[PDB]
Design an enzyme around this catalytic site. Structure first.
Site, mmCIF file in Angstrom:
data_model
loop_
_atom_site.group_PDB
_atom_site.id
_atom_site.type_symbol
_atom_site.label_atom_id
_atom_site.label_comp_id
_atom_site.label_asym_id
_atom_site.label_seq_id
_atom_site.Cartn_x
_atom_site.Cartn_y
_atom_site.Cartn_z
ATOM 1 N N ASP A 312 0.842 -1.195 0.000
ATOM 2 C CA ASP A 312 0.000 0.000 0.000
ATOM 3 C C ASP A 312 0.887 1.258 0.000
ATOM 4 O OD1 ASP A 312 -1.950 -2.065 0.226
ATOM 5 O OD2 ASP A 312 -2.865 -1.304 2.047
ATOM 6 N N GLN A 313 0.632 2.194 0.921
ATOM 7 C CA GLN A 313 1.315 3.480 0.930
ATOM 8 C C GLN A 313 2.690 3.387 1.623
ATOM 9 O OE1 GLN A 313 -1.735 2.964 2.556
ATOM 10 N NE2 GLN A 313 -3.343 3.815 1.241
#
Ligand SMILES: [Mg+2]
Lengths: 749, 744
Positions: A312-313
């Site tokens: 993800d981030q």
């Protein structure tokens, strides 16, 4: 009966089954379903409580009031053909309007670029205007019959993780979560203030599972709602006017939009990086790291662990760059997709422990009536297991819906077995790596910062273009050698470390993986040649050491070392002479023999010398080895090279003596048990270590051995779902025979 | 019907010679050496200007031809390294020139850096052919480029080694660039003319310079280029070149980093300057020979092969030599055209196959099969570009032992003459104007995609197929260069341009595709209705644009992924299996079903989608071009098997671009190409007229004679329906190699 090292998902209305399964699987940790305060019956179990944190989304009430503070990316338009001296370029026609929105707030003439793609020239900003009413740039005074594009700043209005889920599980008209960029001080203050309050509001969370941090990896969608551009390691979506302007101040030069859009490549990890890319990485990483540290510190001050999801981030964290330890993160948790991704997690320095999230995820796409999720469960365990012996991970666990997994008793019993086996391996070895028998170094443009990240576009999804190279990593991930990643910079600055036995260089020409024009740097060629000549081993895969155009007569710059070059249609006047293939050889000893093909091969013979065609090429293919994507018109440089496979008028496998050392060429290497053994024998043969091969080896390629000298043990593992017989050879030359069941393991003194 | 046929003769054969000459209708005879009072036939005698006079050349060995030779790469393992000159070369062919100062004429190169090693850092050993290099960098490779004398003519040497003549003396070649040797050649020729009154045609085989042909230390071919002028230097020539051209050539301008100026290399200024210098000289001397022959009442005839270098038959001014004829070897369609299309001469002749020799004329073999094969391949091409005369070489006595073959030659000669008689030797009507575009243009008409004469191989056949298909196709074919297009634009009569070949070759063009003027000219032309057909890697230029490899990818709808753009998902539109272009591709129903059944890839992260899971197949495209992909979903994919693109078409304004990944020659592929040409040029309505339904047959229309013919390109019966201009049809059933004529 062992307990612990295991994380179990929970959910509301499920107290009974949670405690049963936690008991059964020996879980010491429970993952609270996101948001949610959990059942007291669950909290009373006294397990370590994981709660996930989503720092840069799930707060539309903030960001809708500060929409100029969402993250941004440079976007490149479609190429538009001018048919006179004017051309109009639509900005948004190739992109997904629900994810992306042109930035009209920050002066387009400062921050954007119109490029004539036919000449590579930037168009004068006096020659274009952005239409006031629609997202179209008007260009005038340019050349007819050229192609033009705009590179423009776009706000990202839909968080990619929330988007992907929405589109994948169609959540209909549910509100889209808008991401926010902490580079801006207002947003940053909102984030830390919110985190401070959440910490106060979550006394029973033991582990803050950051999922993840501040910046998405490169992921853009098109107007048909498909994935348009993806790079799991990419930092395209990390810019803003303020960030770009601050960068200019700090580094002393202004980045071009081109330094992000990169001709339409979007700084793919496969591209040889230049200064601009390395500088941005450095600028972004300093800032991301400062802020991750603050989150960890706050987590600690509140009495809790800080755990990062490797996905993800995650951009800007740079887990493999020096200084990662300074963040004080307690753990990294990642998705176990295979051996390579198992290592990507396991090898991370600077954390107290690591955690694997195994497959299948507990969701309806795999847990449906008449499917057997247990097969995939075991498969995933076996691919990760072989890697875990070389570099252990601390913990395992699963994600999704417990209530779904609980409906599949066979799957439940399979997890019981995997969990006990995970703990047994840990307890018998003390969580220490097996003995590596050779030191192997992968050499490319990135080195250690991209450990186990080579030959990858999307996470654990190899395809036609990458699998002939990705297979090298997957083979190595569980192999009985020590593997390190090094860069051309390391080598040019410090030479080749003296403990290294074998260097591997592999990939297509003009990629970060082979290295591009660094191969016309005489100092690199000298360093490698000297080292091979003194007893080093160089294994080149696909297009190793390749540099186009530098020499008319030499494509692979180290063709002399490995004995093989690629014909580039510049040397067709030169007859190529192939020496006879050696079918009986140490490297190929474990390749299954096919007498029908060998006979057909022997009967058909070698091409006799013919004008403009050279000679020596086998008229029919010997075969027996899957080499992946062909490298067309490879040929031996002279007749003293040993050809091991040269089918269809080109070369797949060759070995060459070079002073004390050896060079080996492989045209490509998809992962298979047989190819991993092939690679492994190559490493031993090229390093002149044939006499060291037998110690701690399994005769059967479907099985592996791991030696643990400090605890007086070895194990042997069956990497398949079929029974395997194999003879293990010990250091003293003794042997033992095994009959290993389906996915089994045996341990001996 | 008699004549247009040349028959060879040995000695002691008067009787049968007369029988065959009358069976085949021969109007000329090729003598080996003089015999029988067979003497009113036109008499051919071969002449060998620059060999078979060892008595001369042994007295002037510094006037043998010369070549720059590039040594093996030798690795330095300290600051000195030794480089043997001759170890990789055939010592009976090549000898280092120790006579001309090595420090002025040779070059030592550090291949690792590309730098020339200073002359003060090397010496040539006094007693052995080894150069000593000092003051160099350890771990670099070094080579010497050196002048070598050529001490054995390559025709005499090929033939020697082919039938081991053992100790038979080696014919030493001589270079007429030196005044003493030149004078010897002309005086000798003058005398020879006096002594040869019965000779009507001087068959020069050939002239002054061999094509690039070098042998190794194991007696094998080392380097070959049928069009190459490697073996044409000398210290005098190079000194003179500098005087004329205003710069000194480097030895590197000839060895070319190991490539030796292969015609596949993009020619640079040095290569062109040498071609021009050499051509000027060669032509001047060929004109003299033609003049001399003429003042003795004899014809001058050129063999297209052997020592033909510098003649440049397709370059302007060739006509000025006054050559009566070119004779050439009939290898295939392409090589037939290569002879047929030569301007500037009065007539052309093909030497058909098989050669009358025991390698095919042996007990148990039926040479008529090969005879008919050879004739079918040339015939389809002769229809498009007529040749004047035919004939065979070798021993008539051997062929005479083969009466079925003799019957076959009679059939051939009669049919050859019958085509001339019916059509007056005029070319069939071409239905489209097709231009091949490359770096060379017309100077290399029908010479593209070739290393060794008529010997396609793994590296060439996917592109040579384009030529072999066009050689006999019912369209008009021209060859043009980028310089032509840059200086004059694209001629208003061209319907279709073909660009074909691998990246960074003379055939695609290399960096010319980064010149915006070129790109402007082709795009504008296509957009207004032109047609661009790109084969293999058309318009490719490496590195110029990160995201674009084929520079006219926009035109043809296809580009090649070069591992720079893997982050960009590629979406393939569904294949169109029923289409004008592929209409004659046989549909194998189990294959088509399997393809329809496996379906298309659904989009997956980092993998794009829409590629077929199983192959449709049915077409042999030759060598794969990896990872070609459609630039958008408005391109029509006709074949996109194995996750890449083999065939596609794209509308571009009023015109079209077509991509073909490779095209080995076959009746099917020739048909595929032809339909591509009519389609790309929006001429689908024009395709039917004067066409054969069966791809195994072809049609030639001669409107000026109110006449067409259809020919069977195979040795099997072939049924076919021809459509005529008025929409009418007519049916045929042709036998093996058959022909049929109809009123039109
Ligand atoms: Mg001496």
């Amino acid at each position: 009966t062992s307990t612990g090292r295991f994380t179990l998902p929970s959910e509301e209305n499920f107290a009974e089954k949670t405690k049963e399964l936690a008991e059964l699987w020996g879980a010491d940790a429970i993952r609270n379903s996101d948001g949610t305060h959990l059942d007291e019956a669950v909290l009373a179990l006294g397990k370590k409580i994981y709660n996930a944190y989503f720092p840069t989304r799930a707060h539309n009430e903030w960001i809708t009031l500060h929409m100029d503070e969402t993250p941004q990316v440079y976007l490149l338009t479609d190429r538009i053909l001018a048919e006179s001296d004017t051309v109009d370029i639509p900005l948004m026609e190739s992109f997904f309007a629900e994810q992306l929105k042109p930035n009209r707030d920050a002066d387009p003439h400062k921050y954007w670029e119109v490029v004539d793609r036919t000449t590579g020239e930037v168009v004068d900003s006096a020659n274009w205007t952005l239409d006031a009413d629609e997202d179209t740039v008007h260009v005038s005074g340019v050349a007819a019959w050229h192609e033009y594009t705009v590179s423009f700043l776009a706000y990202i209005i839909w968080d990619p993780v929330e988007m992907y889920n929405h589109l994948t599980n169609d959540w209909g008209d549910k509100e889209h979560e808008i991401p926010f960029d902490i580079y801006h001080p207002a947003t940053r203050k909102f984030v830390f203030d919110t985190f401070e309050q959440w910490l106060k509001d979550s006394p029973q969370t033991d582990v803050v599972r950051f999922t993840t941090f501040f910046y998405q990896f490169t992921l853009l969608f098109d107007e048909k709602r498909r994935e348009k551009v993806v790079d799991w390691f990419g930092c395209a979506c990390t810019v803003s006017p303020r960030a770009l302007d601050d960068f200019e101040a700090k580094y002393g030069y202004r980045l071009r939009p081109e330094d992000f859009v990169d001709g339409g490549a979007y700084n793919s990890a496969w591209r040889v990086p230049r200064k601009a890319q390395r500088d941005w990485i450095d600028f972004l990483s300093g800032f991301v790291r400062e802020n991750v540290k603050q989150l960890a510190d706050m987590s600690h001050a509140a009495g809790k662990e800080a755990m990062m999801f490797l996905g993800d981030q995650w951009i800007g964290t740079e887990p493999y760059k020096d200084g990662f330890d300074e963040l004080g993160l307690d753990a990294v948790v990642g998705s176990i997709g295979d051996g390579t991704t198992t290592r990507m997690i396991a090898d991370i320095p600077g954390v107290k422990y690591t955690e694997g999230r195994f497959l299948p995820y507990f969701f309806p796409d795999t847990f449906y009536e008449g499917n057997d999720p247990s097969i995939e469960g075991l498969d995933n365990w076996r691919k990760a297991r072989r890697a875990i012996l070389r570099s252990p991970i601390s913990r395992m666990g699963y994600g999704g819906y417990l209530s779904l997994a609980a409906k599949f008793p066979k799957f439940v019993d399979t997890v019981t077995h995997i969990a006990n086996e995970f703990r047994d391996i840990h307890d018998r070895t003390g969580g220490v790596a097996a003995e590596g028998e050779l030191n192997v170094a992968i050499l490319n443009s990135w080195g250690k910062m991209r450990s186990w990240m080579a030959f990858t576009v999307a996470h654990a999804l190899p395809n036609k273009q990458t699998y002939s190279y990705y297979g090298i990593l997957e083979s190595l991930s569980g192999m009985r050698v020590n593997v390190r990643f090094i860069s051309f910079d390391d080598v040019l600055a410090h030479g080749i470390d003296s403990d290294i036995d074998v260097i591997i260089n592999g990939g297509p020409v003009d990629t970060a993986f082979t290295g591009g024009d660094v191969w016309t740097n005489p100092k690199l060629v000298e360093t490698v040649r000297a080292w091979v000549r003194g007893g080093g081993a160089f294994v080149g895969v696909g297009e190793p050491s390749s540099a186009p155009r530098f020499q008319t007569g030499r494509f692979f710059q180290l063709a002399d070392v490995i004995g093989v070059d690629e014909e580039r249609y510049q040397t067709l006047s030169v007859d190529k002479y192939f020496p006879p293939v050696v079918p009986d050889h140490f490297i190929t000893a474990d390749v299954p023999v096919d007498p029908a093909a060998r006979e057909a091969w022997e009967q058909a013979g070698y091409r006799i010398p013919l004008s403009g065609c050279g000679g020596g090429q086998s008229i029919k293919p010997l075969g027996g080895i899957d080499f992946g994507e062909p490298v067309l018109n490879t040929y031996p440089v002279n007749e003293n090279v040993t050809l091991l496979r040269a089918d269809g008028g080109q070369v797949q496998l060759a070995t060459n003596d070079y002073g004390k050392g050896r060079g080996v060429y492989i045209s490509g290497l998809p992962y298979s048990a047989a190819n991993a053994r092939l690679l492994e024998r190559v490493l031993f043969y090229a390093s002149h270590n044939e006499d060291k091969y037998a110690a701690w080896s399994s005769s059967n390629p479907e099985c592996e051995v791991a030696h643990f000298p400090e605890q007086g043990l070895y194990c042997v593992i069956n990497n398949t779902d079929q029974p395997q017989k194999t003879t293990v050879t010990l250091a003293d030359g003794t042997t033992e025979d095994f009959d290993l069941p389906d996915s089994g393991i045996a341990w001996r003194e």
